[PDB]
Amino acid sequence: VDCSEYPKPACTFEYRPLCGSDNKTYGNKCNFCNAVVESNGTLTLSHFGKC
């Protein structure tokens, strides 16, 4: 996952989880990438799937 085209003002809501370096499960890639932007690039991907 590349969050380069983020942020996005809206995300669809299917669930395909990713596990962030903050130990939070992100519900989909769009949600994860908007969070990376919001953290100003400090959040990273820990692994695919739930945390």
């Binding site: 299917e14 395909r16 519900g27």
Partner: peptide, 17 residues
């Protein structure tokens, strides 16, 4: 891009699609 959508103030999260 999707058009003709209803906007609301209801929340939703991944999985709710």
């Amino acid at each position: 891009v999707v058009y003709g959508m209803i906007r609301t103030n209801v929340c939703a999260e991944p999985g709710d699609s």
